[PDB]
């Protein structure tokens, strides 16, 4: 199993999945290690190579800080990198089904992680199941995160910004020029990602350079119009200069502020990263997407409003309890260890945490809009979750989906409301952010791993749906007489709920709450 690519040959490795085989080329490099003079620079093309390259194991993950909040706790450590962190991390994986497919649809996954963390080698991103079951070719790439992947000094090629996004782009370009060799159809590529990954995907729809690199897109819990997805021109410069200060790289010639930075240590940049913000939040993205004038040509909010984006179908969705996950990372009275029943004062302090630069009035509004009980104990605990959830993910996701449909294309919106039976976090956190990913990747199809049977039916169904969406642009599950998935139109706004129970078509998800977040809040 050796395939010849435009830059050299690569030796894969066979795997055994559900009484069959799947070929896997883990760790194929796709760009020039972004080291030394190349740190902070757009990914440079790769130098062709000779002698069969061995992609039989995940490569290094990119440099990034790590979640040390719950050591030994699986709930969080399952997201932490599982390969050496290195600046040399521009590698991608390919999972082609076995035997070799003739002209297979490609699914390219772009992991989330707040643009600060993440890696394609996570267990929940193992694309061998999707490969095995739908005979699709899955692709993962590691893209630089943190300041090393999103440091910005607008107009300056030494550190322009969106390097992470260009890494992704370079990887898609790679699938364009090489997927054919693996038996893939470069004319049927579907980008799918979660959180900052979904926000990345949504930006590839706006980026003129990614236009021809993919067909369709799937956005799981995230869109560029999310409060956290894009860093302003100001926030970027202040933060880039502050990172300079912390490392003592303050120069008056930007270009030098950068060279002083290329000499610092990969770790010293990761260490000071966390402080470029005065009072960040559990959802602060110190260094992320910016309007560089290259990948992004104008504030993405405008491009969207005026329909300047790749015209194609999109599958967008969110989990029922997007917010909870973050409440235990700084919200007073919260713990993954108790029922975190907080009082009103605690909710009030909670808001101070997430809406830090928000006015006193603005916080009263959130409170007022979210404290209209129907007088019950877990009222404020749940109110805080939805506030964070609705505000950072759910509403933005709905606004993006909506505006995007307004331009003709078919959009499908889902609402994942199934809590994993294996969920390591407490019950009160419900259907947590990021926890639909395993169902999407068919992990529950594997009957060992202690997942209920019903969860298997669901993962199988979602996997079918996702595949059908990639292949045919319609997320249906046409055989086992299931509920049809209607198109999301700007007026009826129907979404399909994904549950183990009875799937249903409903309308205008979080109508009342999102009107507050999408129309009013932007005003305080
Ligand atoms: C823009 O940056 C300034 C400077 O940030 C400070 O220095 C950085 C290296 C880093 O250590 C930050 O955490 C520091 O705050 C910010 O101004 C500071 O603001 C805080 C609180 O308002 C204050 O305690 C400091 O004295 C200020 N420093 C100076 C000299 O201005 C400023 O708030 C940043 N803009 C933003 C994002 O609001
Ligand atoms: C739920 O737990 C939180 C946090 O407590 C943690 O876990 C417990 C074992 C606790 O004893 C501490 O070791 C840990 O901090 C509780 O909130 C804390 O409450 C105390 C006293 O009220 C207060 O001094 C701390 O500041 C709180 N921690 C913070 C900042 O959130 C909370 O009261 C528990 N809720 C219940 C009663 O279920
Ligand atoms: C690649 O793997 C093959 C098979 O295990 C091995 O024979 C070969 O030496 C490897 N190439 C190198 C040196 O990395
Ligand atoms: C794959 O399908 C495309 C049309 O989408 C076609 O142009 C191409 O030749 C096919 N690839 C194969 C089977 O060689
Ligand atoms: C349809 O049901 C069969 C078993 O009766 C199951 O094996 C198959 O996966 C189901 N189809 C899907 C993709 O939901
Ligand atoms: Cl660790
Ligand atoms: Cl009050
Ligand atoms: Cl159904
Ligand atoms: Hg897990
Ligand atoms: Hg469920
Ligand atoms: Hg309903
Ligand atoms: Hg209102």
């Amino acid at each position: 199993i050796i395939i010849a690519t435009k830059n050299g040959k690569v030796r894969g490795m066979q795997l055994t999945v559900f009484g069959g085989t799947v070929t896997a080329f883990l760790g194929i490099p796709y760009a020039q290690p972004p080291l030394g003079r190349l740190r902070f620079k757009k990914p440079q093309s790769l130098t062709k190579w000779s002698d069969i390259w061995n992609a039989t194991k995940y490569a290094n993950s990119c440099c990034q800080n790590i979640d040390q909040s719950f050591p030994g706790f699986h709930g969080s450590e399952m997201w932490n990198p599982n390969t050496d962190l290195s600046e040399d991390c521009l590698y991608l994986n390919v999972w082609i089904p076995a035997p070799k497919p003739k002209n297979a649809t490609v699914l390219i996954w772009i992991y989330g992680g707040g643009f600060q963390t993440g890696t394609s080698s996570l267990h929940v991103y193992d694309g061998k199941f999707l490969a095995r079951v739908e005979r699709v070719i899955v692709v993962s790439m590691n893209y630089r995160v943190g300041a090393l992947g999103f440091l910005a000094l607008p107009g300056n090629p030494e550190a322009p910004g969106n390097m992470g996004l260009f890494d992704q782009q370079l990887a898609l370009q790679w699938v364009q020029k090489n997927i054919a060799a693996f038996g893939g159809n470069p004319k049927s590529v579907t980008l799918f990602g979660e959180s900052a990954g979904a926000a990345s995907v949504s930006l590839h729809l706006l980026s003129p350079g990614s236009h021809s690199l993919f067909t369709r897109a799937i956005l799981q819990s995230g869109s560029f119009n999310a409060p956290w997805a894009v860093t302003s021109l100001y926030e970027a410069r202040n933060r880039t200069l502050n990172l300079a200060k912390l490392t003592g790289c303050s120069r008056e010639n930007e270009t030098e502020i950068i060279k002083c930075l290329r000499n610092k240590d990969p770790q010293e940049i990761l260490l000071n990263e966390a402080f470029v913000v005065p009072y960040g939040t559990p959802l602060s993205v110190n260094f992320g997407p910016t309007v560089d004038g290259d990948f992004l040509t104008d504030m993405p909010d405008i491009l969207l409003e005026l329909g300047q984006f790749k015209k194609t179908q999109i599958l967008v969705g969110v989990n029922k309890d997007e917010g909870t996950a973050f409440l235990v990372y700084g919200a007073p009275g919260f713990s993954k260890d108790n029922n975190s029943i907080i009082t009103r004062k605690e909710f009030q302090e909670g808001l101070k945490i997430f809406f830090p630069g928000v006015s006193e009035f603005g916080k009263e509004s959130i409170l007022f809009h979210y404290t209209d009980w129907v007088q019950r104990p877990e009222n404020y605990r749940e109110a805080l979750g939805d506030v964070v959830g609705d505000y950072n993910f759910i509403c933005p996701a709905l606004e993006f989906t909506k505006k995007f449909s307004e331009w003709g294309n078919n959009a499908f919106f889902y609402y994942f409301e199934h809590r994993s039976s294996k969920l390591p976090w407490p019950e009160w956190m419900g259907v947590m952010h990021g926890y639909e990913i395993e169902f999407v990747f068919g992990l529950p199809l594997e009957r060992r791993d202690q997942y209920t049977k019903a969860e298997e039916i669901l993962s199988r169904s979602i996997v079918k749906r996702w595949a059908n969406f990639a292949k045919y642009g319609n997320p249906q599950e046409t055989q086992n007489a299931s509920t049809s998935w209607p198109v999301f139109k700007s007026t009826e706004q129907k979404y399909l709920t994904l549950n183990t129970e009875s799937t249903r078509i409903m309308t205008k998800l979080r109508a009342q709450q999102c009107r507050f977040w999408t129309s009013f809040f932007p005003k305080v």
Side-chain angles (χ1 to χ4, degrees):
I1 39 184
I2 294 168
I3 292 203
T5 83
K6 300 263 159 285
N7 271 29
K9 316 143 191 173
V10 314
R11 174 185 294 281
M13 70 191 278
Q14 305 293 237
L15 304 182
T16 309
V17 196
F18 312 155
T21 279
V22 170
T23 313
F25 303 73
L26 306 177
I28 301 178
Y30 73 79
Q32 210 165 311
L35 324 150
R37 47 164 310 270
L38 301 191
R39 169 182 297 177
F40 298 124
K41 288 193 180 67
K42 302 223 289 172
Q44 306 299 149
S45 69
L46 190 44
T47 294
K48 80 167 184 177
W49 77 75
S50 184
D51 217 312
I52 304 163
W53 172 296
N54 280 7
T56 53
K57 72 165 196 165
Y58 290 108
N60 305 319
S61 300
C62 296
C63 294
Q64 42 176 300
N65 293 316
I66 293 184
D67 184 6
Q68 300 175 61
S69 297
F70 313 106
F73 184 44
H74 183 64
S76 58
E77 292 179 341
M78 64 171 276
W79 304 104
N80 288 317
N82 56 311
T83 82
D84 289 83
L85 308 194
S86 178
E87 284 190 292
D88 194 329
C89 63
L90 302 192
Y91 298 77
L92 60 73
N93 322 288
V94 177
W95 281 275
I96 78 189
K100 200 199 189 57
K102 291 283 171 179
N103 210 31
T105 291
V106 189
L107 268 56
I108 306 194
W109 175 256
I110 302 192
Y111 62 68
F115 289 109
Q116 307 317 95
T117 76
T119 188
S120 51
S121 54
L122 299 196
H123 180 43
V124 303
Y125 304 154
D126 202 337
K128 70 190 179 181
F129 298 109
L130 290 167
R132 181 71 187 78
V133 187
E134 301 294 316
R135 291 195 68 79
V136 281
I137 292 166
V138 181
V139 176
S140 312
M141 89 284 291
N142 284 319
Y143 64 89
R144 287 171 282 164
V145 291
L148 289 185
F150 295 95
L151 175 67
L153 223 51
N156 201 301
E158 310 304 309
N162 309 323
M163 296 73 86
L165 294 169
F166 276 109
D167 290 321
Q168 282 170 33
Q169 184 170 282
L170 192 56
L172 309 179
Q173 210 148 171
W174 185 93
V175 179
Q176 281 302 292
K177 300 150 164 177
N178 298 274
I179 212 51
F182 297 74
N185 179 16
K187 286 187 179 178
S188 181
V189 171
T190 299
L191 306 179
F192 74 139
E194 190 267 3
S195 212
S200 281
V201 162
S202 73
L203 288 175
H204 283 291
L205 288 173
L206 302 184
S207 187
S210 312
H211 188 99
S212 64
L213 308 178
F214 70 113
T215 301
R216 281 185 268 296
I218 304 182
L219 293 53
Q220 311 169 188
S221 308
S223 38
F224 70 74
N225 61 330
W228 54 266
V230 185
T231 299
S232 64
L233 201 214
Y234 186 93
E235 301 176 317
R237 190 121 187 306
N238 207 55
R239 300 176 186 188
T240 292
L241 296 167
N242 284 356
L243 181 73
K245 185 152 186 174
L246 300 174
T247 72
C249 273
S250 300
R251 267 49 162 170
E252 71 203 16
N253 178 301
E254 311 200 313
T255 306
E256 286 190 60
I257 290 189
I258 294 302
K259 221 190 74 184
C260 169
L261 275 173
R262 305 206 222 93
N263 286 305
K264 287 302 137 72
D265 239 78
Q267 236 313 308
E268 197 186 307
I269 293 185
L270 276 184
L271 200 137
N272 301 113
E273 264 183 32
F275 314 84
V276 285
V277 277
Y279 191 24
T281 65
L283 267 148
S284 224
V285 168
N286 306 309
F287 294 87
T290 62
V291 189
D292 56 332
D294 187 342
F295 187 87
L296 247 186
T297 59
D298 194 343
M299 285 174 73
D301 28 318
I302 311 186
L303 300 179
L304 177 57
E305 182 68 7
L306 309 172
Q308 308 307 123
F309 45 77
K310 168 178 225 300
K311 292 301 173 310
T312 183
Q313 311 70 53
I314 64 176
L315 203 169
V316 177
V318 298
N319 295 170
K320 170 183 160 185
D321 288 288
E322 297 280 354
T324 60
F326 308 83
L327 304 186
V328 294
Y329 289 74
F334 285 90
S335 171
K336 62 166 220 65
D337 294 309
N338 45 36
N339 45 42
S340 281
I341 298 284
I342 59 165
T343 55
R344 177 190 186 97
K345 192 49 185 181
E346 280 168 330
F347 175 82
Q348 293 184 286
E349 300 306 339
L351 293 166
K352 265 174 133 148
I353 294 267
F354 289 91
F355 305 89
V358 182
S359 78
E360 172 61 14
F361 167 63
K363 301 198 272 292
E364 274 173 285
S365 306
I366 293 178
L367 190 161
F368 174 87
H369 187 73
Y370 276 92
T371 61
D372 177 46
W373 318 140
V374 290
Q375 308 206 294
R376 174 170 168 171
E378 52 293 86
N379 271 329
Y380 287 103
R381 182 194 65 200
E382 290 176 0
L384 193 61
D386 297 302
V387 168
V388 175
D390 292 351
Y391 173 59
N392 296 277
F393 313 92
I394 298 174
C395 296
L398 288 166
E399 199 55 42
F400 171 84
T401 296
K402 173 170 184 180
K403 294 295 184 188
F404 189 95
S405 333
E406 264 155 51
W407 292 83
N409 334 70
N410 279 359
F412 300 81
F413 195 99
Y414 69 86
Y415 186 56
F416 188 87
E417 40 188 31
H418 176 57
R419 178 188 166 77
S420 177
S421 66
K422 284 194 123 192
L423 213 284
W425 298 93
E427 295 288 341
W428 80 250
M429 291 179 97
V431 182
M432 309 183 69
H433 174 66
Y435 289 80
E436 86 287 2
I437 300 185
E438 43 193 88
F439 283 81
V440 176
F441 278 87
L443 267 58
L445 296 185
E446 162 89 279
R447 279 317 226 106
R448 300 19 190 64
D449 315 292
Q450 298 62 289
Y451 270 123
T452 79
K453 167 62 181 170
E455 289 186 318
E456 191 193 353
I457 307 181
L458 179 64
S459 181
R460 182 79 195 78
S461 183
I462 286 166
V463 165
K464 168 53 67 183
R465 285 176 181 294
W466 261 233
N468 274 346
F469 173 72
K471 290 171 185 146
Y472 319 127
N474 204 321
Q476 303 310 323
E477 190 300 277
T478 75
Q479 339 202 95
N480 305 27
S482 1
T483 288
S484 183
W485 194 340
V487 165
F488 186 98
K489 288 168 181 174
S490 335
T491 41
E492 281 183 314
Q493 330 177 318
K494 300 189 188 177
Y495 61 96
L496 174 84
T497 57
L498 296 174
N499 214 322
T500 52
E501 310 198 319
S502 53
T503 193
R504 291 172 163 296
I505 273 52
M506 266 164 228
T507 43
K508 302 161 179 174
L509 174 72
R510 297 267 204 293
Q512 199 237 174
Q513 306 84 168
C514 287
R515 299 197 202 102
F516 173 81
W517 296 114
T518 311
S519 313
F520 179 54
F521 201 64
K523 298 186 289 180
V524 316

